[model samples]
Each structure stands twice: as structure tokens, then as C-alpha cells.
Target: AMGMKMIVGLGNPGTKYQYTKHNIGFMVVDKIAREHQATFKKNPFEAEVAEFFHNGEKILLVKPQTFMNESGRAVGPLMTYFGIYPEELVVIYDDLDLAVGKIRLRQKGSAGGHNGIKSIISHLNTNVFDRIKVGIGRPEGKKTVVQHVLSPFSKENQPLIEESMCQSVKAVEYLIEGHSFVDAMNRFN
Candidate 1:
């Protein structure tokens, strides 16, 4: 909780996967970049990265280029290479089962079956990292999990998230400003 140096936004790579439920992390990070005028630059951290300063805080914005299940491979090395410890990193990703518009911010916890989070936990070997989970909700009906995750959001929900996305960005700012996890949980989660 001293200084924030890195942020890893989890998602599958490529244009074909954009806007899907699983890509919410990518979308939210992009939103943060745009809202704060942070431009991503390529970094050796195994992903497309953006670095900038906001409110005097040095921030590294990362979008993993690897598949969701392999995110920790990129995250672990990135942290190591940059001399960033797990405590200095904040992870943003999507979550199913939680209702749409619901968000949870935690200092650390179990992966809760999220392959991306599971991979990160596996590589990091600790659950003490900060995480912001944007709710994508469970599949509504008989559609397979893959199909539902890949499907586009309804027009109604799309606009709402487009607005709700700002909350995730705000959550990062809260963390960056040294707000306690309990405070953030009460305010945003």
C-alpha cells in the first residue's frame, strides 16, 4: 500500500475477442487509458503496455497478450522484470456469477474458478495482490459458457457498462491513492 507501480488487465488477445464479456478487463483498462490520456507503449512484459503518470503516481498499464488461462506467466515476469513485487500490482479482470454492474475490489482472495485469476495465482504463488473484478454475470439460459462469454452484450447493457466502466478506473485511482482495501470494498465493491 505504499506505491503502485503496475497494473495488469487480463484478457484474450486480438480483434476477434474484443467487446466480449471475457474482454471486460481489456475494455476497462482501455477506458482508463482514454479517460486519463495514458497511451500504452509496447513493453517486454509479454503484453501491449502503456506507462504514464496520473496525480503524481507512476503507473504501468498492461494488457496481457496471452490467452486468459496463461495470464500469470506474463504477469509474474513483468513484475519481476520491473522490480515490482506482487504488492505493488493491481489486477483488473472479468467475473461471471456476479450480477451485471456488480463489482468487487479486494486486496487478495481465491481465483473463484476464473481461469485467468487461477493462472495468475498459480504463477504468483500468492493471493495478496490487489484485484478489481468487473461483473459479467452468469449465462442466462442454455447457451454454453464459451458462447455466452463470447457473445456481445445487449444494447441496453452495453451503454450501461460503457458508463459503469468508469467505476473500475476510479477503483484504480483509489488504490493508487493508498486507500485501504476495506475502504475501497465499501465504496466500490
Candidate 2:
């Protein structure tokens, strides 16, 4: 077995944000937890957590309840509590730079203006964590960025968004199956 894997899916807490673009991270984590029957509960890190094992590796699924910018508050402490490092962390969140329904896996990079990622980078003290950028796309016409992110995908894009999220789910599954990160990227990116 390898070192433990922590999958932190960033999102604002509660039902108001549920099913919206910014909540895509939580949606993906919810799927994984559902599939494995991992019980979700408030853990010490201010996150809704679930624990499961795959291929002898312990996996922690984390959904921060501290809102977007405060996301790192949960993630940082959780990592320390479990003795996990940035290399073993996978953060999933909405990416505005991509087209709707698209997803990208990256080893590490700048936040690209995402406050959530910015917050994570701040807490981790580095940008070397693994991440899955689930595309929600940019604001169009005169729409505000917050308005765009907090809203549901347009009806025409709903199916596509769902498909991409499932793809995101499989990306995690690929890792659970002992596949390399590059392999998952190659298959799903």
C-alpha cells in the first residue's frame, strides 16, 4: 500500500450551494462516498469526512464546510492530523478557465484566480498538490463571476456537466485501482 490519499473537494456548505457549478467538487466527492458507502460526518477539521480503503491504501474524502476562501482552514489541519503531504492530496474544484463540462488533471500550478485554490495554496504553503479542475466556465456577457459560479449549469449543459463529473469520479476510481496519475490523466483528460 502507498501513503494515504486525501481527496479534498472544495465547496461552500449547505443545500443552497448544492447542485450549483461551484459545488461540483462536493458533487464528485459525494459520488465516490456513495459508491463506497463511506459515512459522511463532521470531522475535527471542519469538514464532512468519510473514510474508505482501496487497494490497501486508506482514502479520506473531505468536503470543507468553511466556505470557499476558508477552504484551506479545513484542508490544512486535516492533512496535519493524518500526516499526509501535498503530494498525496488531491483537490477538486470548479475551473472558470475551461469550457463547460471539461475537466483537467494537473500535478500543480497557480490558482488561475480561483480564491478556493488560492486559499488551499496559502495553507499548504506551496502549490505542489494534485488537483482536478472541473470546468464551469467564465461569466458571459455582463454576468458576474460569482453569479456564474453559484448558478446551476444552463439546461443545455446539464447533461454534459453530469457526464464530466462522472468522469471526475472515475479519475478517483482509477487511482483506487492502483493506476498511475498519468494513466488517469491520459484516459480521462
Candidate 3:
């Protein structure tokens, strides 16, 4: 398990939060799990886990079994449980700073105003971990940020949004397939 990596998708768990913009993190990991035939029936470390291998390296897909702000509660322990380095941790989350359908990958930086990222930073006590953001964009004319993120995407935007998820999945592929976070960012961002 020398190259073991934990890929965490941040979001509120359960059927209730499905299809919302805020759940884009969950969606990316879900896609990765699906394409790899990994099942998430296990809840070790307070997370839904899917284990798989790529190019002789073991990888885990994790969805925190809690609300977004509580993400690090699961992530912190999971990393410890698996003996993963902070450098091996990858988080996917929704970002309002970028446009919808855009993706940004960073190996280190500020949380950029994301509660889940903030929580992860607090739990890990560093902002040097890897993160990939799927932008949810600014709110609609009459809605608040909370309402915008919690709402479902319109039919017109779903395709574009899903495309970004696909790119994210591939970005993850690069990471698992012996590429650096900066390497993936150079190729994907």
C-alpha cells in the first residue's frame, strides 16, 4: 500500500442531497466508483468506501457519511486508519469562484471559502493537500448562494456540469496512474 491514495468527495450524504450542485463532489467519486466497478457498501471511518486498483496501486473512493462542513471528521480518521500521507489525500468539492463546467486542480492553497475545505484544513492543520474543484458558479438573479447550491441543475446545464465531472474523473485517473497533482493540473486545467 505504499502508493495508497484516498480520494474524498465532500457533500451531505443520503438520497435527500442528490442531484444538487453542492453534491458535485459526491458525483465525481460516484462516477469513478461506477467505472471501476467498486461498491461503496462499507462505511469504515464514517465514510462510504470503494476500494480498487489501478496500475498496481491501491486507491480508495470515499464519501463522508455526514454533512459537508463535517467532512474532515471522516477524512481525518480515514487517512490515519489507512496510514495515508497528507500528500496522498485528494479532495473534490464544489466551488463558487469558477464558472459552471470549469474544473481547477491545486496541490496546495486556501480553502477558497468552501466549508468542507475549511473543515479539512482545520482537521489536517494544513492547506498543502490536493484538491480538485468543480465550479457551481454564482447564484441566479433572485436566489441566495445556499439556495443555488442546494438546488438541482436545470436541464440546459446538466450536460455541461456532467462534462466537468468526466474531466474530474480523468484528472483522478492521472493521479492514480502515476501522474503528479501538478502534472494532472497541467493536462486538465
Candidate 4:
């Protein structure tokens, strides 16, 4: 085992936001937890948390209950409490820029208009963390960004979204198992 890693899933809490585009982060983390038969528990970090080991490294999967815009409130405290640095964190969130069913993994970068990322950066004081951006496509012609993000995927696209999320789970595992960021991207992106 090299070190512990944190995977933060960005999403609003509550059933209303469960299947929305913004909740893809939650979906991905949930699938990972379920796959490992890991159950999340209420934590002082203000998020539901699941801990598991992969290739001897402890991996913490987090779903911030503070909602999307206030994501830092949960992530910052969680990271601080666990002594995990920004470099050891991986944030997963939906991206409207990329088409549905796509994922882009990056070592670090700007928030690119994502409120969740913005909040995380503000608290972390750097954009040096890794990210797995799941694509949800842009708002259709007349749809508002908020409306689009808060809406669930169409019936026809559900399969695609599901597949992408599964791929994301695998990507997270690769990163935790001593594989480089580039290697994960090469395999999953």
C-alpha cells in the first residue's frame, strides 16, 4: 500500500436529485461501493462514507451531503480530518461540455464553470487534485442549464449513462492501485 486516497462524489442530497445529471458522481461512487459490498455510514465529515482496500491501499469513497455548490464544506473538512492532501483526492462530477456517455480524466485543471469544482478549489487552495468528469451533454436548445442538469436522463440514454459510470468506477480503482493518471486515462478515456 502506498497511501490512502479519497474519492469525492459531487451531488445534491435527497431523492429529488438522485438520478439527475449532477448526481452522476453519486451514481458512480454508489456503484463502486456496491460492487465491493461496502456500505456507507454517517460520518463527521458531513458526507456518507465507505472505506475499502484495493491493492493494499485504503480508499475512501465520499458522497458530500452538502449539495453541489457547497461541496467544499464536506470535502475540505473530510480531507483535513483524514490528513489527505489535494494530490491524493479525486473528484467525480458531471460535465455538460462533453457528450453523454463520455468521461474525461485529468490530473488537474481549472473548474471550467462547475460550481462544485469552484467550491473545492476555493477550499483546497489549489486545483492540483485529480478529476473524473462524466459527460451529460449540454442543455438542449431551449432548456436552461439548471433545468438540464437537474433532469434525469432520457429512457434511451440510460444505458449509455450506466456504462459510462461503470467505466468511471474502474478508472478510480486503477488510480488507487498504483497506476498513473495517464494510464487510467489511456484505458478509460
Candidate 5:
């Protein structure tokens, strides 16, 4: 029952972005909320958020509406308002650098070309927060990053989508309890 307060899901807004690999972060967040019986609503920070009370800890789930790249605009204000420090915040996002169904947890690091992470890092001016990266597999051939991120999952890969997301949800739980990044990586990798 460690005290973890804020959870942010990084992705673009709108229905067009739904069901795409890039939006999987949001999807997993929503699934976690549903599993936790947390209800989401609009907050003054311009985010869709929910609150769950588990083991006497307040877990706030957030999904930024600022598209994929400008996720910081939504995360910073919310964190400030909630008085949640970097260590208490967890960011879940898609990582193309990871293989399919892989997840890597980091105590702190740069965005590594992830627009959402970049925005958050720039706004917070620090990379000390916890991040849980879900693998979406790298693009094949010469496919553009944009195209590969937006493409919907094929029928064959649909089950993997569920598997990784479920793993991500469990990873977040471990992250909140102050588990080591290597432990999370070992458990979810």
C-alpha cells in the first residue's frame, strides 16, 4: 500500500486515434480504471481523470487531451494541483524501441524521441518520474514512424495487444509500490 498518487497515460486524443498502437497507452489506462472501478471525468487541468481508493492510497488516473506530443501541458498542471511529486507519478506509453509484448520500467530518463515523454520532461524540467514503456514492436521495412504508430493491429496480433496491456496494468501496480525498475522489467519483460 505504498502512496502513489498520479498516473498519466500518453497518447493523442480523438476517435481517429483510437485502436491504433499509439493510443494503446490510453486504452490500457482506461482498462485499469475499469478494473479498479474508477470513474473518469473532466478536471480543471484539461484532462480526463479518475480516482481510485486502494489500500488507503489515492490513485488518480489521467489521460491528457493535448494530442500525442503536448502531453506535458496536461500532466504538469495536474501534478502541481494534486501536489504529487515526480516519484509518485507514473507515465504509461507506447515504445517502438521495445519488441512486441515487452515492457521496460525506468526510474528516470529522457524522452528518447517520444513526443509525449518529451513534452512532459520539458514541462517538468526533469526526468525523475517513473515511466512504464509498453512495447508496440518496431515498424517493418521503410514504414514511416507516423504511419506505423497509427496503423491498427492486424488480426494475428490482436491477442498480443491484450497481453501487453494487461502486463502494463500490473506493471503500474508494481511501480506504485516503489518496486525497483529492474524488478518491474524482470516481472513484465
Candidate 6:
């Protein structure tokens, strides 16, 4: 029962979905795991989880194997199993509303039409958890919403993506160290 902070990265499973915009959440969690030398393993909650310490606090980084829309299936079960409360959980996901390269950290809010987030809110029955929303930018009018989210970022946007990920990881580090969410948001967002 010691470090039970459950940080979830929302994404679909399999190699095919690995690099899409919708999988940015997965990318962020993976980056954090790598920085801390943490390796993920398949877990009973239908996800890959990595354990690591930060500032004497135990942190659990999660990447749900469940497809993006069904993220709650992994998050809800893991939180329940670990006895972690909503406030102790952090969900990271892509947001089309934000321009590519932009990032936002919020203490809590409604899903804003994001199915993955909608699922988590539904399962958890609350929206009181923290979240890191990475901007993927909306598709041009020529592309369908689905197509935009499933496609990879353009080469031009790659640098922005990388920068945002680094900032997000730092935000998570600040959070785990007991820094205020507002402080992290001010510094990173």
C-alpha cells in the first residue's frame, strides 16, 4: 500500500497503433519509464505497468492494452485493485482542440468529446483526477476525424511532439515529488 500513485497513458494496443496521434499517451508513459530505467510487464489488469520511485514515492506507470475507447477497462480495474483514489490517478491523452505542440495540465474536467476520456470518467464515476492533455491538432477539413487521429504526425511536427513529451514527463516528476498541480502546470503548460 505504499506508493500507489496510478498514472495511466491512454492508447490502443499492438504495434500498428503504437505511433499514431492517439497513442501519444503511450509515448509519454514509455518515455518516463525509460528515463527511470523502468520496464513494463503485462499485468492482471489488462495493461502493461512499470514501477519506479521518485523522491521516495512509489509511482506506477500504466499503458492500457485495451484500445483507446476502452481505456476505462484497464484504469478502473487497476485503481480498484490497488485501492488508489481518483485524486491519486493521472490520465494522459491526446487532445485535438490543442494545436500540435501545445500541452495542458488540468486538475480535472469533463472529457470534451474524447471517447477514451469519456470511458474513464464513466468507469470511475467521477472527473476529479488529474490529466495531461497533449495537443495533436485537428485534421484539415479534407480528412475525417478518425483518419487524423490514427495517422502519425508530420515530420515538421515531430520536434514539437518530442518537446512536449519531455515537458510532460517533467511535470509528472514534479507532481510525484508533491509539487502542486498548479505549480507544474505553470511551469510546464
TM-score of each: 0.91, 0.94, 0.95, 0.95, 0.92, 0.94
Residue 81 alpha-carbon offset, candidate 4, angstroms: 1.0
For residue 68, give model 4's deviation from the true position in Å: 0.4
Instruction: For residues 83-105, write the lDDT of model 5, one tens digit per residue.
Output: 77887888989888887677777
Scored by lDDT, the top model is 4
Is candidate 2 or 3 superior in lDDT?
2
Question: Against the true structure, candidate 5 has what lDDT?
Answer: 0.84
Worst 10 residues of 3 by lDDT: 136-145
Model 2 lDDT at residue 38:
97
Task: Report the C-alpha lDDT of model 4 over 83-140, residue by residue, as the tens digit.
Answer: 8898789999999888888999987877576899988988888888899999998776
Clashing pairs in 2: none
TM-score of 3: 0.95
Stretches off by above 4 angstroms in model 1 are: 140-143
Per-residue lDDT of 1-189 in model 3, one digit per residue for the tens? 557989999989788797889999999999999999999866766789999988678899999986998888999998888889898898999988888899999878876667888888889999889889898887665458888888888889889998999999999988888887888989988
lDDT digits (tens) for residues 126-158 of candidate 2: 988788999997777445888998888899999
Model 3 RMSD in Å is 1.6
- TM-score result, candidate 5: 0.92
| C-alpha lDDT (0 to 100) for residue 43 of candidate 4 | 95
Candidate 6, residues 12-74: lDDT per residue as tens digits?
A: 999999999999999999999999999999999789999987666779999999898888999
Off by over 4 Å in 2: 141-143
- Comparing 5 with 6 on lDDT, the higher-scoring candidate is 6
Model 5 shows how many backbone clashes?
0
lDDT score for residue 41 of model 4: 93
lDDT (0 to 1) per candidate = 0.81, 0.88, 0.87, 0.89, 0.84, 0.88
Off by over 4 Å in 6: 1-3, 141-143
